[PDB]
Design an enzyme around this catalytic site. Sequence first.
Site, mmCIF file in Angstrom:
data_model
loop_
_atom_site.group_PDB
_atom_site.id
_atom_site.type_symbol
_atom_site.label_atom_id
_atom_site.label_comp_id
_atom_site.label_asym_id
_atom_site.label_seq_id
_atom_site.Cartn_x
_atom_site.Cartn_y
_atom_site.Cartn_z
ATOM 1 C CG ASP A 153 39.567 3.833 -22.815
ATOM 2 O OD1 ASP A 153 38.509 4.480 -22.829
ATOM 3 O OD2 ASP A 153 40.612 4.194 -22.241
ATOM 4 C CG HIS B 14 34.350 7.453 -23.095
ATOM 5 N ND1 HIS B 14 34.904 6.893 -24.216
ATOM 6 C CD2 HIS B 14 35.185 7.155 -22.075
ATOM 7 C CE1 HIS B 14 36.042 6.296 -23.892
ATOM 8 N NE2 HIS B 14 36.219 6.415 -22.585
ATOM 9 C CG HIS C 51 37.607 11.378 -20.892
ATOM 10 N ND1 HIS C 51 38.474 12.241 -21.523
ATOM 11 C CD2 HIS C 51 38.114 10.138 -21.061
ATOM 12 C CE1 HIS C 51 39.477 11.547 -22.032
ATOM 13 N NE2 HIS C 51 39.273 10.264 -21.765
HETATM 14 MG MG LIG Z 1 40.405 6.866 -18.634
HETATM 15 ZN ZN LIG Z 2 37.910 5.960 -21.324
#
Ligand SMILES: [Mg+2]
Ligand SMILES: [Zn+2]
Length: 313
Positions: A217, A72, A68
């Site tokens: 995502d 990313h 994260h």
């Molecule tokens: Mg998130």
């Molecule tokens: Zn994410």
Amino acid sequence: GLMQFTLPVRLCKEIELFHFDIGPFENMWPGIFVYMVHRSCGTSCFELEKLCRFIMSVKKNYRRVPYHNWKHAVTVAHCMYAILQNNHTLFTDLERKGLLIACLCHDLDHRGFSNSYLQKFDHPLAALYSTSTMEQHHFSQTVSILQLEGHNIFSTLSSSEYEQVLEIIRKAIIATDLALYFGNRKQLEEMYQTGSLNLNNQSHRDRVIGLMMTACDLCSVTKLWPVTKLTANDIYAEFWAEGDEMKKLGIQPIPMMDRDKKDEVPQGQLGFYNAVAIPCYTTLTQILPPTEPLLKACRDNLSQWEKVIRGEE
Ligand SMILES: [Mg+2]
Ligand SMILES: [Zn+2]
Ligand SMILES: Cc1cc(C)n(CCNC(=O)Nc2ccnn2-c2ccccc2)n1
């Protein structure tokens, strides 16, 4: 105005593809993001001085965590660029502006722990935001950075356009809470199948933008097999640290987060592809046909994990 960003030839061509990997050269990632804004939005969308200052403040507020992280953020923004470029006329000027910024900011100040771990730890953020804990914090951090001096990339928008774009960004960031994905896709599935889906219905657009945010995502599952396989190590590095921290609170973690149960990983990836990823990209392809390459890539990777289990790799 006459200052463009240009990429080397291989990047200039490969960046248009869904499966593009932004590479291991961190100092090139800001240029790649500006390149995408300019082609997706225009050279006029943002004051280049303000954008560059916004981008570097956002970078600084991502932490050095295995998954994260800043890489990313830029990866999820590239997948949104690819969806927008393949769906040219479906999205407004504000939406193209909003969504690329929302993707870059979506995991601001992530510590590598789930909402569940914050709740069991009794973290102050769990008291301040009872649901979508980290995602409300990510949007909060986005508003903070926009309000630094020299950092308001939306200053040229009217009062109402400004409120519209911050509302697009807020909804987009909240939608990256995977707990909200299951119901959102189910509702979109029914609406598409009964033919009630209407892209001029704002509440319907919101749902479609939410699914795009989930698709972007999760896009590490849609890369070529060597990229997906190596990214899986980073995502599991965070899960095992969280599981270690559950053990420290006297709670046996689920097997997915227990580092004593690495053997169960391939079957855990199967479950994730079947329960989350395939349904996500199937519904996205039904609603936005040109995103089909993401569904194809996801299927290829499910089949690669099936081979890992059958001991063929
Ligand atoms: Mg998130
Ligand atoms: Zn994410
Ligand atoms: C690469 C790459 C990138 C990403 C996001 N993965 C997936 C890693 N697994 C994962 O996130 N699992 C997860 C989190 C919350 N629920 N679930 C879950 C849901 C259904 C079945 C099994 C697990 N791989």
